[PDB]
Amino acid sequence: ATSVNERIENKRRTALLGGGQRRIDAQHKRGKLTARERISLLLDPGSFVESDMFVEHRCADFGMAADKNKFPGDSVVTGRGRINGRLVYVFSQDFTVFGGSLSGAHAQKICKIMDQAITVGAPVIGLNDSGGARIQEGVESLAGYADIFLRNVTASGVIPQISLIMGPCAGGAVYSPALTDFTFMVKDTSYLFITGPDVVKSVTNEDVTQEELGGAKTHTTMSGVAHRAFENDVDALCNLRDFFNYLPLSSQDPAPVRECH
Amino acid sequence: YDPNEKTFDKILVANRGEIACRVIRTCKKMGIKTVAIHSDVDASSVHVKMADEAVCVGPAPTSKSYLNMDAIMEAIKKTRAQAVHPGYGFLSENKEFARCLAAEDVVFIGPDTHAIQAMGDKIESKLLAKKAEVNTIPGFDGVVKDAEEAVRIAREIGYPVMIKASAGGGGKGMRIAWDDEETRDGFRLSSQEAASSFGDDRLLIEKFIDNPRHIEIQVLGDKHGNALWLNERECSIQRRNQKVVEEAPSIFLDAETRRAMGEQAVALARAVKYSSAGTVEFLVDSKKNFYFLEMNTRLQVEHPVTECITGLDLVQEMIRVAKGYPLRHKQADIRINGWAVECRVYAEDPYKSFGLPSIGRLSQYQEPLHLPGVRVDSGIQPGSDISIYYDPMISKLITYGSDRTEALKRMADALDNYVIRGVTHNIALLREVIINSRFVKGDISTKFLSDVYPDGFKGHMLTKSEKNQLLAIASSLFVAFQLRAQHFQENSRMPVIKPDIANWELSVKLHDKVHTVVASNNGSVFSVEVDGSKLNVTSTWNLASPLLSVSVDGTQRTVQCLSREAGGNMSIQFLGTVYKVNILTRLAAELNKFMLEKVTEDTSSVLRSPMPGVVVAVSVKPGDAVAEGQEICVIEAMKMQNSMTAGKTGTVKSVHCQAGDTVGEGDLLVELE
Amino acid sequence: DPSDRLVPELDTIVPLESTKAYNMVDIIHSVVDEREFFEIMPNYAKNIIVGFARMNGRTVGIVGNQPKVASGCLDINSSVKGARFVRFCDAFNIPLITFVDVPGFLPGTAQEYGGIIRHGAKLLYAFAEATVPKVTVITRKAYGGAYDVMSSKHLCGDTNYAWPTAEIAVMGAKGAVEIIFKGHENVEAAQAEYIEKFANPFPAAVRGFVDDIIQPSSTRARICCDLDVLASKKVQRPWRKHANIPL
Ligand SMILES: CCC(=O)SCCNC(=O)CCNC(=O)[C@H](O)C(C)(C)COP(=O)(O)OP(=O)(O)OC[C@H]1O[C@@H](n2cnc3c(N)ncnc32)[C@H](O)[C@@H]1OP(=O)(O)O
Ligand SMILES: Nc1ncnc2c1ncn2[C@@H]1O[C@H](COP(=O)(O)OP(=O)(O)O)[C@@H](O)[C@H]1O
Ligand SMILES: *C(=O)CCCC[C@@H]1SC[C@@H]2NC(=O)N[C@@H]21
Ligand SMILES: [Mg+2]
């Protein structure tokens, strides 16, 4: 008798449930979904296939060798699907597990998805919901951003890259959306800033909150970083679907032609 | 040196810089472990890396790092040091330091406490010397009483009247008077300045010697009552009462006078019961009459030069004496072997006040160790930094030869192959003094720098032939750079066509004059036409090395190109002096005459500080009116205080200097109309 | 000018204290041939330095941080100033030499309202798409994602070096201890342990992030030899009409 079957089911249940039901309830109380139903709403029904669902982080310092600091998926859901019959590769970040902070496995999965997409010639859509880089990981975390950043420059001009900020992205993770072709934000829910208001108050002796520092209105009215702002998650995904419907798959293909009346 | 003999196994050096390095080298040669002390600024000095172990003693100021006895004693106790060498300065001649060290168990390399106590003030030293049958100044001995007593003394001491501050000296309270009324007014001025002095409030009246010559006798003694005099030393070239150029054998003295001086010095040392190395200083007139003047109970700065004519090592001998061993030499064993000349290279600008301190970081530094008969003693290295708290001494250079002429020629050669980039030095003044006709002849005095340059040091005044050589070298260097700029690699797509030019016609602007130069190249040989004069210069034309050796008409010269730019400005070091020239082509020079002259909004009325440091006292306030020749404020940096002069009349609009702040070099200080 | 000339004056140029500022122009002058350096835009955005020099007779582009001005923090102007120069140097086949001393990006409301993200992305892209040989030397520090912005090893960099006084981390010690050891409410021993363990280049050295830790006096001799072996660099990349600069 082998217990390799029940462990698979337990790992699947933990991956679906994330880091716990209390964090899920906290996610919903802000009027905010989680990664998996975002993916389901974005993609066609019964067309999403997920890659690398059994990957764990390999941290060994600051007491993460215990099971309480171990979570399957490593706060990222990556895969491929179809929109209106055309292939696409997607990745979404989960704030439940360590606030979506970058780890080795997170960057590895993102890089693998980008490599596959650039190999086959399909667009990449990224739903960004993070909190920065994991400090306990160390320099290994920083390299992850680099391993992403290079792949954002290699694929620039080859395949379209779309980014949608769905939460408070901060730190060095804000540079990946700036290196993509288009940027979209959800108002009253998403933020973008290099440093938090606390550091600004400490250094420049100036008082400001997160909404006025990195809010959607600031980045869509005077900063010029984002392109459009949407009311909520469902409207954002609905608009992103037809926006993707406009644009082609790769620079080797001609502009799409539809049926006119 | 014999390492078999028993000697201390741990020496702590209580100094910094050059003398610490010298002592460290000596004990390393003698196989003795050493310990070094340093402040926070000197944590990266040369002497803290040469010596095993290092102890931090406190902050940057000397009052808390090198003069803090508690820190030194704690370091000695922690390091289990058995002996301490003070070098010179700081605590070398401190009365309480000797007792504090000799209390527990520590032996102090130097004179005993009684010797320092006796030779510490100018009152009892004179009477002690008189009791030892030593020639002294015929000035009256005794503390002055009042103006009437002062003039009564001045009646029978001679028409020239010296007034001096007792006890501590250092160039304070030293004043002149001739006339009896002038004598009494100078005496009351001396009395009031002594009342405002450090506290002695005692004056000494004395006689002047006309055209003084400062001679020194190096004495060495032990604890068994033996005393030796190691020849004499000539030190007359001084500014601000500080020696710059040293000469071991005295060209002014014969055998009999030298013997008499040495015997008198030995007798004086025996009277004091001296048991270490020291120097006795004398003032000598034209009639070879020598008078005693002060005794230094420590190791002197100019000690290496007398080592070049005797072959002894003073540091090793004095360490052996402090150990308790009798001297292994006799008087008949000391002989003069050749000639030796020493120069003291400082970090200061000689063009103002014969040297004013400057700071900076050494971009690069190279010594002429490959030249024959050259020895360099330095406590610096490439990348070293110069702070504002210590003496600005960079290094000392010693050259020895068979006779005076060879030593002087070697010194002149060595002063040209010395590379210092990063700070300003006084090498030009040294080279000008060395090749001076009066210095070569041998008629010098303590006022040598006061009459040769009555207004100040203006650089080397070069003759017509030297000017032609300089212009030819500059033109040749410019043409060599232009020719080097044309050498590319083969492209195989757009081949380069090297321009074919025969002659280069150039306009060279030097000082405030313009010369026309024609340059021709024939490989490694340049032919130069300078105002109708033929010159021929050859060299390897290595444009990367900091030293260029050229031959102009058979004469060998060494030059250094300090700075060069595309605008034509070049800074070239010729004969130890830096010259600025502007080289242009004929067409460029002709077209440059149409350029409008750039307005320069600096016509006096500016009092930019000539030296960095901390101002201690400002004598004016904003809105006041100043007068010519009146000091404004006093800035203290590198052991000295300097007050800038005046010469224009106006109203000070603002004052940017306050007591306790730090002022950088070239910073605007006083603004006036 | 020999290619193996030593530069002993660079051994103690970097102060021991982390709050003191030095001059990178002195290091550039010491390293390059004949102390000659042609600076571009010397009076604008003084916290970054860009220029042309020669190494063993070969034209090179020098880019570096200036700790003397604004502690070396990056801002809007310096990002564009460096990015344009790097793009030109790549476009006309010129090797790049980089000196890294950066604590991060300059914070404030004006920088965020001006779009610092776009210009940081410009500079990062300019270093990322570089195909000419690149040599990087880290002098004192490189904090946060800015370390990636300065052509780290992971952006297809060829050779990276670090001086013994260098140190690389994620953030400062205070931020790390206040974001990791929050429950312990004791930063006395925690800060000491963090600065003893991570305030040094070994964590990046043991993980292969930096090629070697070299003495400063041998910096020049290390660079020239590298420029001898990287002169034949060739990189193949996917075809495209032109990429999308974040202009
Ligand atoms: C390359 C440049 C870098 O390295 S940037 C590194 C990030 N530096 C920082 O100072 C962290 C900034 N992040 C934040 O302030 C918050 O997470 C923001 C973005 C405001 C989210 O808002 P908020 O809902 O109030 O957060 P929260 O109180 O619910 O905390 C949730 C949990 O997320 C975690 N988290 C966040 N970021 C990291 C990170 N980089 N590394 C490790 N953990 C992180 C927090 O530990 C927090 O834990 P907890 O559940 O509150 O106990
Ligand atoms: N009686 C004197 N007569 C003529 N010149 C003197 C006399 N005393 C001093 N001078 C000058 O004073 C200067 C310094 O005298 P000194 O006793 O050595 O003090 P210090 O220890 O500060 O050097 C000498 O160089 C000398 O030129
Ligand atoms: C300051 O750092 C003390 C050492 C420098 C002065 C010492 S002591 C007196 C000697 N005369 C001189 O010019 N240097 C020597
Ligand atoms: Mg004296």
* General form of chain C: globular
Report the portion of residues of chain C in β strands: 15-25%
Ligand identities: propionyl Coenzyme A, adenosine-5'-diphosphate, biotin, magnesium ion
Q: Which class of secondary structure composition applies to the elements of chain A?
A: alpha/beta
Number of beta-strand segments of chain C: 8
Strand-pairing-aware structural class of chain C: alpha/beta
Main beta sheet of chain A: 7 strands, mixed
The shape of chain A is: globular
Span between N and C termini of chain C?
41 Å
Order of helices and strands of chain C: HEEEHEHHEHEEHHHEH
Quaternary organisation:
heterotrimer
Strand ordering within the main sheet of chain A: 1-2-3-4-5-7-9
Modified residues (Phosphoserine) (chain A): 40
Subunit structure (chain A): The holoenzyme is a dodecamer composed of 6 PCCA/alpha subunits and 6 PCCB/beta subunits.
Modified residues (N6-acetyllysine) (chain A): 68
Domain CoA carboxyltransferase N-terminal (chain A): 1-259
What report would you give on this structure?
Chain A is α/β, with parallel strands linked by helices. Chain A is built from 10 helices and 9 strands. Chain B has 673 residues and is α+β, with helices and mostly antiparallel strands. Chain B folds into 5 domains: 4-136, no CATH class; 137-208, no CATH class; 209-446, no CATH class; 447-595, no CATH class; 596-673, no CATH class. Chain B is built from 17 helices and 38 strands. The longest helix of chain B is centred in the last third of the chain and has 21 residues, at 464-484. Chain B starts with 10 loop residues before the first strand and ends with a strand. In chain B, 36% of the residues are buried. In chain C, helix 6 (173-180) packs across helix 7 (188-197). Chain C is 32% helix and 18% strand. In chain C, strands 1, 2, 3, 4, 5, 6, 7 and 8 form an 8-stranded mixed beta sheet that branches. Chain C contains 9 helices and 8 strands. The chains are: A alpha/beta (261), B alpha+beta (673), C alpha/beta (247). The interface between A and C is large, with 48 and 48 residues. Bound molecules: propionyl Coenzyme A, adenosine-5'-diphosphate (ADP), biotin and magnesium ion. Biotin binds next to loops of chain B. Chain C: Residues 2-241 form the CoA carboxyltransferase C-terminal domain. Chain C: The modification N6-succinyllysine is found at residues 182, 197. Chain C: Residues 33-66 are annotated as: Acyl-CoA binding. Chain C: Belongs to the AccD/PCCB family.
